């Protein structure tokens, strides 16, 4: 069934998975029209779909041509995430397709069940897990491919850069969701934390800072601090 | 008027007939059921006094034969049996009538309730679905279960219903992910109606048919088939008028006959919910809301 704390490891495992999260896929701006009423602008957005073994990121990115002359968007997001999941899975070799899909959101499942009624050895499953991939709009570089998108496209990111040359997928994993966590709850900081020393760079084909080991502990440690923080600052503790 | 004779009653035994039940006891002089109404298909159904455990019956119309009622002590049961032998029957019926050892199918004359409940239930199409070609009878229980429930395993003794999935290759058109399955009226019009059902008729037929089984038996296949059918139409845009108040008559009367105290397990809240509030035909079932809303309050 769905997936939580207690079956967390079955994430870096051998069998091929993939998490959908829909999140980013239908995006708007909110304004008030010259008659005072108000009006949704559509901007670009992107289904993020993630091998989390490999940090394989399959980006596809929704451009606002898609909802033109469309009515229930939000519905229609789950219907368009699925078809275009069901699309990246075809695309794929038999021996790279998936055999779970993981849906971060449960209003998922059925547009994906039916969607993928071609293949029903992939087991459709939810989590309970609360991650925080809706924060991956908040990497430069992604974020940047999605807004210049001027067509339907699909992206192709490593979202673990190289980090599995020297950490397991594990950690990989457990890295990338502190990172986004931190990210969804102060971004400014966040991003503060990652870039303050400009010594440490951004390689080109990567998305993160090439940080040392020592290095990325103090980052793991500062983004926990803040996450602790922003958690106070909230709640007043 | 038709007659279904007993042999005997030697155990103590809840027997129905239609809509209609009362208390036979042990070895209480019983020799059946007269004055049966010819023109409707009929079920005769039992519960033992000691296990309530199954209940079961028998399917029949009397134009199709003379039926009789035997205990079998082997196994355990009230069997239906046909006498081949036309003046043996004749009789028989005529002895015990003239004993006076039968109750009357007890039918009151502004009384519309079996005909409303049955108008689509055909015993030669039930036969179909309780496959047992040897006998033109057919035997339910509450046990028995469906074809689709045996996907999910004595294939001789099931509810061969119309399999309906509303999340499989039938009922959804590639390309057409999200439409058909929003709006189900491909799969209710021309696959269901027209490619298996061939006309509305026979798609109340089995309608009717799963709820009676539900109802009368406990048979829980039979509700979900009842319940799967009824959602089909009540997720559809697109139904012929006459369907959608052909239906609101059948759920009406459906409704009215179901025991108030056995609501709880055979009226499934999301099915009726849905489609009394949120389906496309939500507008369409006035009669059959106006008595959910004043009867079962509780489950919406
Ligand atoms: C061959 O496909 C399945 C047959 N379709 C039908 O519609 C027949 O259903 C029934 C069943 C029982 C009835 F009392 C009336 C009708």
């Given at each position: 069934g769905a997936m939580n704390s207690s079956n967390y490891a079955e994430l870096f495992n051998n069998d091929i998975k993939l998490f959908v999260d829909d999140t980013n896929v239908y995006r708007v701006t909110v304004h008030k029209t010259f008659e005072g009423n108000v009006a949704?602008?559509?901007?670009?957005?992107?289904?993020?779909?993630?091998?989390?073994?490999?940090?394989?990121?399959?980006?596809?990115?929704?451009?606002?041509?898609?909802?033109?002359?469309?009515?229930?968007?939000?519905?229609?997001?789950?219907?368009?995430?699925?078809?275009?999941?069901?699309?990246?899975?075809?695309?794929?070799?038999?021996?790279?397709?998936?055999?779970?899909?993981?849906?971060?959101?449960?209003?998922?499942?059925?547009?994906?069940?039916?969607?993928?009624?071609?293949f029903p050895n992939i087991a459709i499953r939810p989590t309970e897990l609360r991650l925080p991939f809706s924060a991956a709009m908040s990497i430069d570089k992604l974020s940047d491919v999605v807004m210049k998108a001027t067509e339907p496209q699909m992206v192709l990111f490593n979202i673990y850069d190289?980090?599995?040359?020297?950490?397991?997928?594990?950690?990989?994993?457990?890295?990338?969701?502190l990172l986004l966590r931190a990210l969804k709850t102060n971004e400014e900081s966040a991003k503060m934390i990652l870039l303050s020393d400009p010594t440490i760079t951004i390689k080109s084909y990567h998305l993160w800072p090439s940080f040392t080991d020592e290095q990325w502990i103090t980052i793991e440690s500062q983004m926990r601090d803040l996450i602790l923080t922003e958690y106070g600052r909230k709640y007043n503790v | 008027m038709n007659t279904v004779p007993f042999t005997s009653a030697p155990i103590e035994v809840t027997?129905?007939?239609?809509?209609?039940?009362?208390?036979?006891?042990?070895?209480?002089?019983?020799?059946?059921?007269?004055?049966?109404?010819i023109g409707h298909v009929h079920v005769?159904?039992?519960?033992?006094?000691?296990?309530?455990?199954?209940?079961?019956?028998?399917?029949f119309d009397c134009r199709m034969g003379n039926f009789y009622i035997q205990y079998d002590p082997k196994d355990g049961l009230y069997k239906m049996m046909e006498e081949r032998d036309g003046a043996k029957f004749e009789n028989i019926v005529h002895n015990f009538k003239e004993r006076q050892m039968m109750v009357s199918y007890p039918k009151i004359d502004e009384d519309d309730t079996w005909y409303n409940l049955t108008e689509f239930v055909q015993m030669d199409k039930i036969r179909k679905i309780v496959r047992k070609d040897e006998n033109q009878f057919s035997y339910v229980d509450s046990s028995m279960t469906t074809v689709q429930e045996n996907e999910l395993?004595?294939?001789?003794?099931?509810?061969?219903?119309?399999?309906?999935?509303?999340?499989?290759?039938?009922?959804?058109?590639?390309?057409?992910?999200?439409?058909?399955?929003?709006?189900?009226?491909?799969?209710?019009?021309?696959?269901?109606?027209?490619?298996?059902?061939?006309?509305?008729?026979?798609?109340?037929?089995?309608?009717?048919?799963?709820?009676?089984?539900?109802?009368?038996?406990?048979?829980?296949?039979?509700?979900?088939?009842?319940?799967?059918?009824?959602?089909?139409?009540?997720?559809?845009?697109?139904?012929?008028?006459?369907?959608?108040?052909?239906?609101?008559?059948?759920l009406y009367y459906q409704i009215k006959t179901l025991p108030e105290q056995y609501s709880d397990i055979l009226l499934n809240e999301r099915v009726w919910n849905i489609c009394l509030y949120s389906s496309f035909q939500k507008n369409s079932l006035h009669n059959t809301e106006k008595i959910m809303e004043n009867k079962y309050p509780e489950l919406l």
């Open positions: 949704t602008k559509a901007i670009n957005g992107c289904i993020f779909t993630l091998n989390p073994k490999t940090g394989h990121l399959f980006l596809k990115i929704i451009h606002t041509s898609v909802w033109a002359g469309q009515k229930r968007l939000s519905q229609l997001a789950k219907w368009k995430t699925a078809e275009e999941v069901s699309a990246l899975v075809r695309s794929l070799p038999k021996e790279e397709q998936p055999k779970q899909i993981i849906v971060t959101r449960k209003a998922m499942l059925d547009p994906l069940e039916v969607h993928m009624l071609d190289d980090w599995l040359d020297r950490i397991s997928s594990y950690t990989a994993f457990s890295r990338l969701t | 027997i129905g007939i239609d809509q209609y039940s009362f208390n036979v006891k042990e070895n209480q002089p019983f020799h059946g059921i007269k004055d049966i109404p005769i159904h039992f519960q033992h006094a000691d296990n309530s455990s199954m209940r079961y019956g028998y399917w395993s004595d294939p001789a003794h099931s509810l061969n219903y119309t399999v309906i999935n509303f999340k499989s290759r039938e009922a959804i058109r590639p390309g057409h992910e999200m439409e058909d399955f929003l709006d189900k009226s491909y799969y209710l019009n021309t696959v269901m109606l027209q490619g298996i059902f061939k006309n509305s008729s026979n798609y109340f037929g089995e309608l009717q048919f799963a709820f009676l089984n539900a109802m009368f038996f406990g048979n829980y296949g039979s509700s979900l088939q009842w319940h799967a059918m009824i959602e089909l139409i009540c997720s559809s845009a697109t139904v012929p008028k006459h369907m959608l108040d052909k239906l609101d008559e059948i």
